[PDB]
Amino acid sequence: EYEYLVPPDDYLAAGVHIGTQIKTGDMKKFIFKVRQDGLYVLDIRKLDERIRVAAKFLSRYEPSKILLVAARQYAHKPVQMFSKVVGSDYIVGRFIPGTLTNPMLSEYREPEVVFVNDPAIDKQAVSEATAVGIPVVALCDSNNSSADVDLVIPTNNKGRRALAIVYWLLAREIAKIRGQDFTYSIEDFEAELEGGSH
C-alpha cells in the first residue's frame, strides 16, 4: 500500500535488493530476509524511503557545495551523470588524502556535504569529512557499517545496474524538486562496457 518512486520490479530487475554473503549489525534494520544462495536481501521499501529523503536533503544545497566520491569502477559513470544533472562536484578514482583537510593540496575543496559510494572503499573521504564535521551521505550494502555516515541509503552498491538506477533516481527527484527538465533514462547512467553499446 506504499508508493514507490518507480515500479518495484524495476528496482528488483536492477538488483538493488541483492546484498552479499555478509550482514553487519548496522544494516540489520534494512535486511528483509536471506536467500537460498545465502545472499541477504535489502528492503526495497526502506531504500525507496531513503532515496526520497536524500533527494530532498541534497536539493537544499547549492550544487558545487555537494561532493560525490566513488573509487568503485561501476560508480564512475553514474556519479558523473548525477553531477551533470545536479551540478555537484565529484571525485571518481583515487581520492587524494588531504582533499578536504589540507588547504595546501591543489585538489583541496570545501563541500558542505559529501556523498560517497561505499563507506569502506571511500573511507578516506568519509574520514576527512568527519574531521571537518561535514555530513556524509553514503550508499550502504549489507556488508557496510554506517560508521561515520549521517544518511544511510541501503542498497546494493556493487552492481552496474544497481548503482545506475539509484544515482538516476536521486538525480531525477532533485531535478523534479527544482522543476528542472530531466530526460535521462536508466541506461544513460550505467557504466559502459567494452564491447557494449553507446
Side-chain angles (χ1 to χ4, degrees):
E1 179 235 62
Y2 171 89
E3 313 187 10
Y4 296 83
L5 287 175
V6 295
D9 281 346
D10 284 21
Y11 270 129
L12 298 176
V16 291
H17 55 150
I18 306 171
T20 68
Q21 291 296 311
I22 288 179
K23 156 220 292 185
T24 65
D26 298 31
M27 295 302 292
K28 82 302 163 48
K29 55 170 67 188
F30 305 118
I31 300 183
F32 183 58
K33 167 63 180 175
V34 190
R35 299 189 318 163
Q36 293 303 299
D37 51 42
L39 296 178
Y40 291 107
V41 169
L42 301 163
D43 187 15
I44 278 193
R45 165 70 174 277
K46 286 285 177 300
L47 167 57
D48 197 77
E49 305 188 320
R50 296 308 179 82
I51 285 179
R52 305 187 98 127
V53 166
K56 189 60 209 306
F57 173 59
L58 294 181
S59 65
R60 297 179 71 199
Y61 291 91
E62 75 170 43
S64 57
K65 291 298 186 54
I66 301 183
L67 170 72
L68 274 60
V69 173
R72 168 164 287 122
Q73 174 59 213
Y74 285 141
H76 298 199
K77 188 55 150 57
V79 174
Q80 197 243 58
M81 288 299 128
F82 175 100
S83 291
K84 182 176 174 175
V85 169
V86 168
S88 65
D89 182 20
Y90 73 82
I91 298 174
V92 295
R94 181 174 128 82
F95 190 86
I96 296 304
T99 299
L100 302 179
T101 65
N102 186 325
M104 297 298 86
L105 195 76
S106 70
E107 301 95 309
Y108 180 76
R109 55 199 84 191
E110 315 196 305
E112 283 182 356
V113 57
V114 168
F115 174 21
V116 312
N117 163 253
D118 192 294
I121 287 177
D122 303 306
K123 69 186 177 193
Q124 180 56 47
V126 178
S127 287
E128 284 185 45
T130 304
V132 166
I134 292 171
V136 170
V137 177
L139 289 188
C140 297
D141 211 349
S142 58
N143 59 293
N144 287 130
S145 64
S146 50
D148 292 74
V149 184
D150 297 281
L151 171 47
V152 179
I153 294 176
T155 187
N156 160 358
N157 58 18
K158 296 175 179 49
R160 169 179 170 289
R161 178 91 172 176
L163 296 179
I165 196 166
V166 168
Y167 279 100
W168 177 76
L169 283 166
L170 279 176
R172 187 189 79 177
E173 287 304 300
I174 293 173
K176 169 175 175 177
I177 292 172
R178 298 180 180 174
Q180 187 181 301
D181 174 73
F182 184 94
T183 65
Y184 302 95
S185 80
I186 293 180
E187 289 63 39
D188 291 316
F189 276 59
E190 281 177 294
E192 294 190 2
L193 307 176
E194 187 193 277
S197 45
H198 311 285

